[PDB]
Amino acid sequence: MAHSPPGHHSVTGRPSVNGLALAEYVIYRGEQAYPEYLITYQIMRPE
Amino acid sequence: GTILIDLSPDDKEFQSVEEEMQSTVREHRDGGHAGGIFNRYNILKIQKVCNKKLWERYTHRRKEVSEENHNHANERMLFHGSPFVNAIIHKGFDERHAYIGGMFGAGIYFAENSSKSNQYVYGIGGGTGCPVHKDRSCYICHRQLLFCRVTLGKSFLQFSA
Ligand SMILES: Nc1ccccc1-c1nc2ccccc2c(=O)[nH]1
Ligand SMILES: [Zn+2]
C-alpha cells in the first residue's frame, strides 16, 4: 500500500459533481478498520 | 479465532444496521453497470464478527491515532464490498485487500453509500458479476458486504468528481 499523506491518517474523497453522492474514504493501514458486521443480502428488482 | 453471531431481526442492533444499509442506497453514474439496478435490498442475515485478536489490533492502532490527533480517533461506521470478505473476517484487513488502482492511491477503500460498496462485491467495477450467472445485476445470488468500524484520524480532504 501507499502511505497516508504526510501528517494525515486517511484520505476523504469528497464528491464535487454528483450532488447526491456521499463520501468515500481510504486508509493505508489494515489495523485502522475492524469488520464489525457481515451483511448477507440480495439486490431487489425495481417494480 | 473468528466467530459469527447471528442477530435476530427483532434486535435493535439488527434494525439500526439494516436501516443504514437501506437508507444509503443511491443511483450510480454507470446506470447500474457495476452493481446492478436496484433501489433497495432484501436483507437475508446480519452477523456480528467477533475476533479478540483482530479487535485488539484495531484498538491498539486507534489509540495511536487518537494520541496523534488531540484524543480524537475520528471513528466512523462505513461499508466495504470485496471479493475477499471471507479472508477479511478471519485474518483482518491488510495490503492484499487494497485497491491498487484507486483514485486516492493504493489503500483500502470504504463508502458511506452501501450501494457504492455493492459495486465491488464481485470485483472492481463488478468484475464479471455473480459466479453462477455472470450477471452484475443478479437478483438471485446472495451478496455480502461488511459494515466496518474505521479510524480516520486526521483525514486529507480531496475534492473530486
Ligand atoms: N476497489 C476495491 C478492490 C478490492 C476490494 C475492495 C474494493 C473497494 N473499493 C471501493 C472504492 C470506493 C468505495 C468503496 C469501495 C469498496 O467498498 N471496495
Ligand atoms: Zn447469480
Residue numbers in the entry:
A (entry chain H): 1115 to 1161
B (entry chain A): 952 to 1112
Question: What does the paper behind this entry write?
Answer:
Two homologous tankyrases, TNKS1/ARTD5/PARP5a and TNKS2/ARTD6/PARP5b, catalyze a post-translational modification, poly-ADP-ribosylation, of target proteins. Tankyrases are enzymes (EC 2.4.2.30), which belong to a family of proteins known as human Diphtheria toxin-like ADP-ribosyltransferases. Tankyrases control β-catenin phosphorylation through regulation of the stability of destruction complex by ADP-ribosylating Axin and therefore inhibition of tankyrases offers an attractive strategy for treating cancers with increased Wnt-signaling. Tankyrase inhibitors interact with the NAD+ binding groove of the catalytic domain and they bind either to the nicotinamide subsite, the adenosine subsite or span across both sites.
We hypothesized that the nitrogen would not be close enough to form interactions and therefore we tested amine (13 and 14), hydroxyl (15 and 16) and methoxy groups (17 and 18) in both positions, which could act as hydrogen bond donor, donor as well as an acceptor, and an acceptor, respectively. All the substitutions were tolerated except methoxy in ortho-position, which likely causes a conformational change in the compound not compatible with the binding site. Crystal structures revealed that the amine in ortho-position (14) forms a dipole-dipole interaction with the side chain of Tyr1050, which however does not seem provide additional overall binding energy.
